[model samples]
Target chain A: QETALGAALKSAVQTMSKKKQTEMIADHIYGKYDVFKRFKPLALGIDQDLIAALPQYDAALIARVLANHCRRPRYLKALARGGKRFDLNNRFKGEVTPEEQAIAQNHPFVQQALQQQSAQAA
Target chain B: KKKQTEMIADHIYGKYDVFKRFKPLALGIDQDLIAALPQYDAALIARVLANHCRRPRYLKALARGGKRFDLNNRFKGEVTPEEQAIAQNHPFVQ
Candidate 1:
């Protein structure tokens, strides 16, 4: 059975286009949280932080939105560059590891960004 | 030697209508495959099932979530809500 939180989110989002719902959720997080706004590498457990802060929201939906946010070319580029990870409160939690940076650099979105840069130069 | 996965695929694709149709398979169907193919390594059967289930088309069918069939195409079970949710959330489905 869907949790009350999940049901509620499903109902609220039912009328919105999937893209619109994602954008709304992303905008809400970005506007409300410094870490998301800054596009800082998120702490490993940042989903827990988001769940705690938005207790009324569905955890799955939040995770989906966060994933969409993280997959953006700009965000993948940020990850490729490597930096300290931060919590929603903008507190530093850890540094992005070399392996994580390499993985991000190889991500298709990051590769697309690189190709676009080279295409423009040419 | 042909890859175990390829041999398993050939066997199932040749013999099972359910697999040939790429239908959503019944849960625990691996046991059925093992029982049917006594000569094949059980672990290899399980691994092949895992590989088949991860294919995008299989995942799409699973995400649609209706009746699940056995190797014989017999109705064996219905996809559970949790199973559908997992399939829908799969990276391939996304």
Candidate 2:
């Protein structure tokens, strides 16, 4: 029924690489929607009963966040506890445990987001 | 008069939470009085402000117009009211 919509989406994807797709989805969720307000619950593992405080949410973006970070129970728990993992604030006063340090160092999504951020800025 | 002044100052500082105290500076509170109080003088204000500025989420909350600075259940990534107060009063935030 929505031929134009499907055609437009197809064209949009055709011009985009996998890297670009990921970047756009991340950007739409984090930059456009104010990630802290809209997706903080998801990031913090409290995913449900979220009021759509902004405009519509993209299913793809939801999937991307889940697959990349939220679905992983370890990462979700790490995000909630202020543990060694996801110490976004360098001013954290307490000691970071070894395991938390490892996740902070090795989480693929964080590194990916950081690289994309730097790339976009550059 | 000095005793009355001291009593009022003590009441103001002691009675309100950080957010209420902050509201007066931005809108209702007499900052001059707060500064005039010997115990909460300019040095104390500056110290409190500095403590708040060090937290990023609080700084962001100030930028967002100061509504999100929850005190009791402040999340790890979320900003605190004291910090938001510091950020909101900064020249850059306005």
Candidate 3:
């Protein structure tokens, strides 16, 4: 994606600043066909040859590039993964437990125990 | 333009997850509409999705949070009198 832009997706594309690259990439995604006319720039931490290097992306990626992107944005998986910098979410969310629920209800086994209605006629 | 049209595509605009869980009103739902209330068929939903994908509103009233409904960009239908009445009567209301 960068060779055509005279820059690179990662730090290798030193000509343009990181923020500028992001704006460029976002614009390209948002305005794909219209960007060239507007000087649109797309940046991510991707290298085409690096993409070319990956076996998973080899055959299909090659064929796909030949089919689309004007030979640009050919094998982009960065924007999909929040671009270049992948964040670690060791613990994403929290959940509740049954014992905790029993404590909250003021009885250890209230859920298991039934209440008596008393004075039932036979 | 196509992207703008896509942004306002004829979305099923509701819950499919609910539909998947047999709830029929997940994120891809249109289940509450008159067409959906009692029950709905997968084929009908598929048809609606197909129709929406083909034609979309290119522009619309931008009053809301870029979330306003765009009218039909290329409608290929004839509005029956009943439909016309519904459109004109309280265009401000549902």
Candidate 4:
């Protein structure tokens, strides 16, 4: 991820005013890739590594990098806690609670409860 | 220009989470259409067809809250005949 652009951004933002840095990031990066956030590593391609370090520099800054959203939050939490980045290799193993399984199997709905708890709990 | 099919396929593959949960419902679509998707991404394709809309239209709809088809046949003719014809085939709707 330590490419020329990342390095350039690192160098440029260091002495620049906060407004200018935010402007550059907004115009150059998010302006280009914001629309494709859901694709994750696929749309991010080689660019994910390029932007991972962006968070280290400015935690509030938005970048193209994103985590998978579709996997069972249980599985996602397990993977994250297990030190995984939710790449394509671990994307598909999804599951729902037995209650949900039965409901969708029979029918489905909204319910009030003690905060949607799962095995790994996102 | 990249073919519309490839773009559709890429978009579906990228956002596979959008389709996995309702896979059983989507699987009712044509097998060949399912086969055209990127590995496990067939459910999105099935979902698009299950809604009887083309890829671009379906994705737009999904982005702004997806549609819920009536379980009965009431919404069948909502899509154009061309869209339905495209849905019945594989790859073309990609």
Q: TM-score winner among the candidates?
A: 1
| lDDT (C-alpha, whole model) for all candidates | 0.73, 0.40, 0.27, 0.35
For residues A19-112, write the lDDT of model 1, one tens digit per residue.
6556666777989998788778877777777878876556677888877677577776777789898877788887775434544565567788
The two-chain DockQ for each candidate, comma-separated, is 0.02, 0.02, 0.01, 0.02
Candidate that would win on lDDT: 1
lDDT of 2 by residue, B24-81 (tens): 1232123533554566555444434333333444344444543332222232243333
Off by over 4 Å in 3: A1-122, B1-27, B30-35, B58-65, B68-94
lDDT per residue (tens digit) for residues A7-94 in model 3: 4345345314545544444443334333222212222222342244434333433333322332122122111112122111112122
- Predictions ranked by lDDT, top down? 1, 2, 4, 3
Error of 1 at A118 (Å): 7.6
- Residues B12-89, candidate 3, lDDT per residue (tens digit)? 343323212211011222333325433445445444533332221210111111121212122223222211222222
**Each candidate's fnat, in order?**
0.00, 0.00, 0.00, 0.00
- What DockQ score does model 2 reach against the true complex? 0.02
In order, the B-chain TM-scores come to 0.85, 0.32, 0.24, 0.25
Error of 2 at A34 (Å): 17
Candidate 2 chain A least-lDDT 10 residues: A41-50
Q: CAPRI verdict on model 3?
A: incorrect
In angstroms, the error of model 2 at A45 is 24
lDDT of 4 at A95: 30
